Enzyme design. Structure first.
Site, short mmCIF file in Angstrom:
data_model
loop_
_atom_site.label_atom_id
_atom_site.label_comp_id
_atom_site.label_asym_id
_atom_site.label_seq_id
_atom_site.Cartn_x
_atom_site.Cartn_y
_atom_site.Cartn_z
N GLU A 279 -5.12 -3.46 -6.93
CA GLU A 279 -5.46 -4.10 -5.66
C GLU A 279 -6.49 -5.19 -5.91
O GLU A 279 -7.42 -4.98 -6.70
CB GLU A 279 -6.06 -3.07 -4.70
N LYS B 138 0.20 3.69 -2.90
CA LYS B 138 -0.92 4.63 -2.91
C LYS B 138 -0.45 6.08 -2.96
O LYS B 138 -1.14 6.93 -3.52
CB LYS B 138 -1.83 4.38 -1.71
N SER C 191 0.77 -1.25 0.00
CA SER C 191 0.00 0.00 0.00
C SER C 191 0.80 1.29 0.00
O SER C 191 0.22 2.36 -0.17
CB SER C 191 -1.04 0.06 1.12
N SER D 215 1.20 -3.29 3.88
CA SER D 215 1.48 -4.66 4.26
C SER D 215 0.93 -5.59 3.21
O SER D 215 0.10 -5.21 2.37
CB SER D 215 0.93 -4.98 5.65
N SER E 39 -6.11 3.56 3.77
CA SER E 39 -5.60 2.45 2.95
C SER E 39 -6.73 1.70 2.21
O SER E 39 -6.67 0.49 2.00
CB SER E 39 -4.71 1.49 3.77
#
Ligand SMILES: CCc1c(C)[nH]n(-c2nnn[nH]2)c1=O
EC number: 3.5.2.6
Length: 263
Positions: free
Chosen positions: A141, A48, A45, A212, A105
């Protein structure tokens, strides 16, 4: 050469079971501290930040872009959607999606940012445009989090990410308004208190983005304003040999503590 700080990071790594990557830029003197600084790690992440920044860049030539609605359909929901699930069958603006991706997230939010950029390669193209030759985003994702050892997909190096984060948050990769917005978003992160920040003196302020994934991959990238010092940029990446390994945010906190005490 191996510095005292590098020796301490090596000892931390040895006790951790996994592989640790660190890059610090101290803007007081522009010096750097690197540990596995040129090894690749899965970003998870932390990517992002690059996607939100790329949309901010687009907004420099479109005043209304951040207010542009994006439809959120039931089919768009992926594995972690704390904000987007509230707005299903409605819309969220690109600003709302950026804030949700960065501060919570939200993975559906990330996918909308990636789509606005024309796919993962659009995020990579933005990286190249701001001088980052290392970053690559290959997937959306949630599959960008597979974090398979040796897999170059969705990876960068600590050195490259620290340089890029510096240029985005403290330098001129973005317009002034956009840079300030990115910093505001990062400083409002909700997920960071157990990671880099946990290793810093309480008096310091920071913005960060955690990540993570599989292989117990546990990451954080931060811009830090120490008490009475020029800002720091710190990247801490960590990954483990077994696919189902547990997260180790404490290892990132320990790395940050070593870095802070070494100043
Ligand atoms: C999808 C749930 C999730 C993963 C796999 N990583 N992650 C995270 N960790 N740190 N910041 N975001 C999460 O919130």
């Amino acid at each position: 050469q191996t510095s005292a700080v590098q020796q301490k990071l090596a000892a931390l790594e040895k006790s951790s079971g996994g592989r640790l990557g660190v890059a610090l830029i101290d803007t007081a003197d522009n010096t750097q501290v690197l540990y596995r600084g040129d090894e690749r790690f899965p970003m998870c992440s932390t990517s992002k930040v690059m996607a939100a920044a790329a949309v901010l860049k687009q907004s420099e030539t479109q005043k209304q872009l951040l207010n542009q609605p994006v439809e959120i359909k039931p089919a768009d929901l992926v594995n972690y959607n704390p904000i987007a699930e509230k707005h299903v069958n409605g819309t969220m603006t690109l600003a709302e999606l950026s804030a949700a991706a960065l501060q919570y997230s939200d993975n559906t939010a990330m996918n909308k940012l990636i789509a606005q950029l024309g796919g993962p390669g659009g995020v990579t193209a933005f990286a190249r445009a701001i001088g980052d030759e290392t970053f690559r985003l290959d997937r959306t994702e949630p599959t960008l989090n597979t974090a398979i050892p040796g897999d170059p997909r969705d990876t960068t190096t600590p050195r490259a990410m620290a340089q890029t984060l510096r240029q985005l948050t403290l330098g001129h990769a973005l317009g002034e308004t956009q840079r300030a917005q990115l910093v505001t978003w990062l400083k409002g992160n909700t997920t960071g208190a157990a990671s880099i920040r946990a290793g810093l003196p309480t008096s310091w302020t920071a913005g960060d983005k955690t990540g993570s994934g599989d292989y117990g991959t546990t990451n954080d990238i931060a811009v830090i304003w120490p008490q009475g010092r020029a800002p720091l940029v710190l990247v801490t990446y960590f990954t483990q040999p077994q696919q189902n390994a547990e997260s180790r945010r404490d290892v990132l906190a320990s790395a940050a503590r070593i870095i802070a005490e070494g100043l």
